[PDB]
Amino acid sequence: AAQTNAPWGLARISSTSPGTSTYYYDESAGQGSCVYVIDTGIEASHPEFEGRAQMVKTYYYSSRDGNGHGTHCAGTVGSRTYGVAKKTQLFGVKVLDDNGSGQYSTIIAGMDFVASDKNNRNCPKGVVASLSLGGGYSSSVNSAAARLQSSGVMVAVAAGNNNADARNYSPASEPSVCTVGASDRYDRRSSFSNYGSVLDIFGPGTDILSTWIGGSTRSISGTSMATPHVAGLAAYLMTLGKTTAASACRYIADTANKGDLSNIPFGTVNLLAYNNYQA
């Protein structure tokens, strides 16, 4: 399948070079996989989700996304127009309030919830969790991410937006999950992206057009935007049977575009998520 005039990030993910505008992908499009977007929620009624999105848990007064960020992330995972994995199932877990903030205890709870909740869902091709959040190092947040991953969910987490070594941030610094840095459309490391040896992979993170609350769309930037590209790609690849939750991050790294990025500091991988699609 080919989506023409796609958002640049989706194009980038299916090309060996920057500058293209078509997103090439297999029609399976992540069908039968499930992605949990652990964030501010998801506006499930957005037409772009085509009924494939559902809120499953909230830690606040409502399950609504009053922020936008979770909806945006979910859209890059699996909205029709803006998503990597256009037929995946999306589950929202609202661990962040409508200001986009949340206590580590809540974020942990949300991760443990997903490890359990996945056992009640029909996700025959596998389960992904996209965590576009982070703060200062916490061994207990890391251990939560590690447990989620160990439970059989492919955990993709944002590197963080401090232009710093991601080793001081959580759950970015948990080695067992898939820590995602951001790139821009010119194949530069996004100026805000964390870096370091704990990064597994880069994805498109600057000026990413996706869904937003009120049935709207908008373009925002962040490692938060890169993570769902990688999470969507994992769901997509799992649906194709190319990899499993346990080894998707490594598969993605192994099949990545290598060496294409600029301003990558010594010690950080130069790997850009790539779907390897061939028609």
Segment 146 to 185, residues that bind Ca ion, using CB under 5 A:
175
Tell me if residue 46 is catalytic: no
Query: Is 200 known as a binding-site position?
Result: yes
Quote the CA–CA distance of 196 and 173 in Å, as a whole number.
9
With H, G, I as helix, E, B as strand and everything else as coil, classify residue 3.
Answer: strand
Pick the stretch among 30-38, 39-47, 113-121, 250-258 that binds Ca ion (CB under 5 A). 250-258
Dihedral of alpha carbons 98, 207, 18, 75, sign? positive
Q: Give yes or no for residue 247 binding Ca ion (CB under 5 A).
A: no
Closer to Ca ion by Cβ: residue 85 or 261: 261
Query: Is 265 known as a binding-site position?
Result: no
Going by their DSSP bridges, the two strands 216-220 and 208-212 should be labelled as antiparallel
Query: Is 223 known as a binding-site position?
Result: no
Q: Give yes or no for residue 187 binding Ca ion (CB under 5 A).
A: no
Q: Which helix (H) or strand (E) holds 144?
A: helix 139-150
Angle at which helices 69-78 and 223-239 pack, to 10 degrees? 30
H-type alpha helices, 221-262: 223-239, 248-254
Closer to Ca ion by Cβ: residue 99 or 197: 197
Quote the CA–CA distance of 207 and 220 in Å, as a whole number.
5
Closer to Ca ion by Cβ: residue 175 or 214: 175
Query: Is 207 known as a binding-site position?
Result: no
Tell me if residue 229 is catalytic: no
Contact 110, 70 (CB under 8 A): no
Residue with tokens 């996004």: 190
Smallest gap from Cβ 67 to Ca ion, in A, equals 27
Quick one: which of 2, 16, 103, 136 contacts Ca ion (CB under 5 A)? 16
Q: Which one of 79, 130, 190, 224 is the catalytic residue?
A: 224
Query: Is 175 known as a binding-site position?
Result: yes
Smallest gap from Cβ 59 to Ca ion, in A, equals 26
Return the active site residues: 39, 69, 224
Q: Which residues bind Ca ion (CB under 5 A)?
A: 16, 175, 200, 257, 260
